[PDB]
Amino acid sequence: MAPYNETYASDYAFAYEGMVSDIAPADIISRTVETSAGIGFGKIVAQGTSDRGCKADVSAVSPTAPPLGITVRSQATENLTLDKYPRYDGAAIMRKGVIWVLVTDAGGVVAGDPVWLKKSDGTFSNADVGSSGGLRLAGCRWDTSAANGALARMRVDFDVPPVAGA
Amino acid sequence: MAPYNETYASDYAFAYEGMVSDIAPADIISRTVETSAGIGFGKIVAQGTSDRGCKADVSAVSPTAPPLGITVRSQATENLTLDKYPRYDGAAIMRKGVIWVLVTDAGGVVAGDPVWLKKSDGTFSNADVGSSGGLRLAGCRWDTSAANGALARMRVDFDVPPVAGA
Amino acid sequence: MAPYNETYASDYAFAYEGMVSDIAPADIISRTVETSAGIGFGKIVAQGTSDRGCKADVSAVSPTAPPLGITVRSQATENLTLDKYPRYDGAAIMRKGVIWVLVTDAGGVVAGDPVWLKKSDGTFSNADVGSSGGLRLAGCRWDTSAANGALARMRVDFDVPPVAGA
Amino acid sequence: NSPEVLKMHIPMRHRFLPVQVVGLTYKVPGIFRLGGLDIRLPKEVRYVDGY
Amino acid sequence: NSPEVLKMHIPMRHRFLPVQVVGLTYKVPGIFRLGGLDIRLPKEVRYVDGY
Structure with missing residues (x-):
């Protein structure tokens, strides 16, 4: 019956920190x-x-x-x-x-x-x-418009080699 | 009983404009x-x-x-x-x-x-x-020999970034 | 009852020359x-x-x-x-x-x-x-440490174009 | 508030499809289909702002 | 060598899950769930090196 952290939201949120969105392909790897x-x-x-x-x-x-x-x-x-x-x-x-x-x-x-x-x-x-402190994940793109510190879904492909940017 | 556009073809054609050929993977995306x-x-x-x-x-x-x-x-x-x-x-x-x-x-x-x-x-x-009016789809290749204005099947991968060609 | 090529191995080997390791995706192509x-x-x-x-x-x-x-x-x-x-x-x-x-x-x-x-x-x-006699398979990586002339598993993606190295 | 002024068609309601299984993961789809709201007589709807 | 010195817990022995068919290939995954060896009384086990 825990009512703490009640914000009376207008409607449901979108997702959580690391949840996926269904699609046929996925390489999930056990490390x-x-x-x-x-x-x-x-x-x-x-x-x-x-x-x-x-x-x-x-x-x-x-x-x-x-x-x-x-x-x-x-x-x-x-x-x-x-x-x-x-x-x-x-x-x-x-x-x-x-x-x-x-x-x-x-x-x-x-x-x-x-x-x-x-x-x-x-x-x-x-x-x-x-300042030579960032990489570009070459095969990657966003899929949602989002503000600072919000959740956005992105499409990812890690077989494409990254690009160094100074 | 519509016999217009009868060409009495030797055998069946190969495919139509945008038909796919079966294979296990496919990213199909709804836009x-x-x-x-x-x-x-x-x-x-x-x-x-x-x-x-x-x-x-x-x-x-x-x-x-x-x-x-x-x-x-x-x-x-x-x-x-x-x-x-x-x-x-x-x-x-x-x-x-x-x-x-x-x-x-x-x-x-x-x-x-x-x-x-x-x-x-x-x-x-x-x-x-x-004339700087063409791109190369880096990850893409053909799979059929075909003449001008004919249908050919190609294998496509759009996560690889394109290459600009002048 | 063929005991030739008996080496009394300590434990089972890892794999054979071209065996795969299970995972959801695979493009297998008939040529x-x-x-x-x-x-x-x-x-x-x-x-x-x-x-x-x-x-x-x-x-x-x-x-x-x-x-x-x-x-x-x-x-x-x-x-x-x-x-x-x-x-x-x-x-x-x-x-x-x-x-x-x-x-x-x-x-x-x-x-x-x-x-x-x-x-x-x-x-x-x-x-x-x-000596301009080698290519780099751009999207490819190893997955095991192995010595000379041993079996190692690697992850492969052939849609990424290769890179020529002189 | 008459069916000749406003109208919203919903041919199909929410249903669920069988379960697909892929490498220790059970992916389950579910679909529906509707049509957007349609205001046929726009002079029979009036907005008053500032109350 | 008593159960009060050493123990090893294996909740799940070995399991075969249903077969999934992907384009003229059948893939049966097998899973087993076990833990590590536990030495509860370390003063009742002794190592001597250099023999």
């Missing part, structure tokens, strides 16, 4: 979490050192060492970390479907835009940062 | 037609202004604003436009499968060739036009 | 073998002259004429050629899944590496040969 803390749901991941592991640290990704994919919302995750994949757990990375993610940009994004990754934190945006 | 007139079946489409719409006008596509996909033959399309998707209708764009399209080239095409788009009209060909 | 001798199981193939044929000779592949794919282990292949696709036979080419192949490199490969093809013989390696 093992390597970071000491968990990994959030809609997040980018790099290639681990365990030959099948992944890390949440993408500060050193390059066109030669591209990022691995994006985690998905699992909803059965050990109930000790709130919404995360705990250490030593199947990660369920996705690299082909359409997924809801979080926007980090001042002016927001619109339907068809490039997707730029900020290597410092691992956040998605519309344009390059400008 | 809304934005052009005042309809859109033909085997045609290229650009990104609309309605955040899920499409236009048949591809005169301004670039590597920064890649084309969206290719429509497919639906066979249930409002019977007022002969073989088209009327205005304000689900468009069924395809961007992964193998599809029959129309050839516009003097010397024809053979099995494995690049696919070049002429931005002026939106026709597919074998080589670049030569 | 007809054109070479006089057969074609091995985990091998690269080029575009034939029969509009649906394939050859094992990839000495002339280029970015303009990319390779076609990789054959898969069929296990029902006419029992006259030991492990090959005989002449005039369905070839079952694969161009999207993850497949076990043979490594030809001095220092071996690790988890995430580029895949380089040596056009002279048609062998996969980690780095370019260095």
Whole structure:
């Protein structure tokens, strides 16, 4: 009977942090979490050192060492970390479907835009940062107009090599 | 009992304008037609202004604003436009499968060739036009040898960014 | 009761020459073998002259004429050629899944590496040969650390155009 | 408020389709179809703003 | 070597799920769910090296 965090919303929300939207194709890949803390749901991941592991640290990704994919919302995750994949757990990375993610940009994004990754934190945006600290995920595009700090769905394809931007 | 347009053909034809050939994968995408007139079946489409719409006008596509996909033959399309998707209708764009399209080239095409788009009209060909008016669909290839103005099937992948050719 | 070639192995091996590893997507394509001798199981193939044929000779592949794919282990292949696709036979080419192949490199490969093809013989390696005799399969990556002349599984996507390296 | 002034057609209501199974995931579709609202007599509807 | 020193928990042994048919190919997935080895009393296990 818990009425806390009641906002009396006009209508239903759109999605959650890492939920997918149904479509026939999806590469979902099982990896093992390597970071000491968990990994959030809609997040980018790099290639681990365990030959099948992944890390949440993408500060050193390059066109030669591209990022691995994006985690998905699992909803059965050990109930000790709130919404995360705990250490030593199947990660369920996705690299082909359409997924809801979080926007980090001042002016927001619109339907068809490039997707730029900020290597410092691992956040998605519309344009390059400008100090050799951003990559462009070459095969990727948005699918929703959204403001700053809101959820937008994007279409992703990680087999296309990334592009470095200074 | 309609015998008009009888040509007494030697054997069955190969396909129609926008028919697909069966295969396990296919991204078929639902878009809304934005052009005042309809859109033909085997045609290229650009990104609309309605955040899920499409236009048949591809005169301004670039590597920064890649084309969206290719429509497919639906066979249930409002019977007022002969073989088209009327205005304000689900468009069924395809961007992964193998599809029959129309050839516009003097010397024809053979099995494995690049696919070049002429931005002026939106026709597919074998080589670049030569006046900064053609794109190369980077991930695309033919699958049939065909003469001028005939049907040929091609394999298509629209997640690979296009290449500008002057 | 045949005990020849008994090595008393510690545990089961990993895979065979061209076996696949299960995953939802796979483009498997039916081609007809054109070479006089057969074609091995985990091998690269080029575009034939029969509009649906394939050859094992990839000495002339280029970015303009990319390779076609990789054959898969069929296990029902006419029992006259030991492990090959005989002449005039369905070839079952694969161009999207993850497949076990043979490594030809001095220092071996690790988890995430580029895949380089040596056009002279048609062998996969980690780095370019260095005399305009190697291609880079742009969308391709390894998935196992393996030594010289061992089996390693790699993820493959042949719609991305290759890159020439001198 | 007459069927000759306003009209909304809903030929088909919401139904569910069988379950597709793909690699340890059960994808389930569900579809419907309707037609937009249609104001046939626009002089029989009046807006008053500023109350 | 007693159940109060060592233990190993295997909730699910090995399972075969239904077959899914994708274009002239049949794929049967098999799953098994198990945990790790537990040494509850570490003072009753001894390692000696260099023999």
